[PDB]
């Protein structure tokens, strides 16, 4: 039995921590909604 609990507002925050790269990937999406890498 699942339940929900509020965790915050949805707002852009100035000076948030900035990280993560920006990879360009060839992918395939199957009928079950799973993504896989195409090589």
């Amino acid at each position: 039995d699942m339940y929900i609990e509020r965790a915050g507002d949805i707002t852009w925050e100035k000076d948030a921590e900035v990280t993560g790269n920006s990879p360009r990937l060839d992918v395939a999406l199957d009928e079950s909604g799973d993504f896989s890498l195409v090589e």
Binding site: D1, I4, R6, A7, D9, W12, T19, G33, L37
Partner: protein, 156 residues
Amino acid sequence: GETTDGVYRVMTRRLLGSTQVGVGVMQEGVFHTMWHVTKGAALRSGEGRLDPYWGDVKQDLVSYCGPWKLDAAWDGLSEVQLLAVPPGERAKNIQTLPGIFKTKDGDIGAVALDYPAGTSGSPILDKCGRVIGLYGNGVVIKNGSYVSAITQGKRE
């Protein structure tokens, strides 16, 4: 129950203690999350019940109480923020420049940030605070790192 717009944790008491299985967005009276978080089950909000209204396994999305309301899109150029809501931890904004998933049916933005599975459904936002998609359906690349699609629904 609580109908205020915002980001919410999705919890279950079926396992050990109270476990966070995902996250979602309440907007215009509709609850939005990824299909793999709830498997399309009904949800509770206080003494109230939220019933599924639309869902699609291939898109990995589901809406409750009404049709999918989120229609903003990544502009393809700007940094975005993941409003990460990890299990047992405070909501935190992380800014990043999305990468791209290139598919046979078109290109999708993707965010290279790694959080626990219970963070699935956390919203990705643009500089106006609009939700451009949900985090949590993606792939594991060569170096073992996780990259999530920016998954967005269609507003009918």
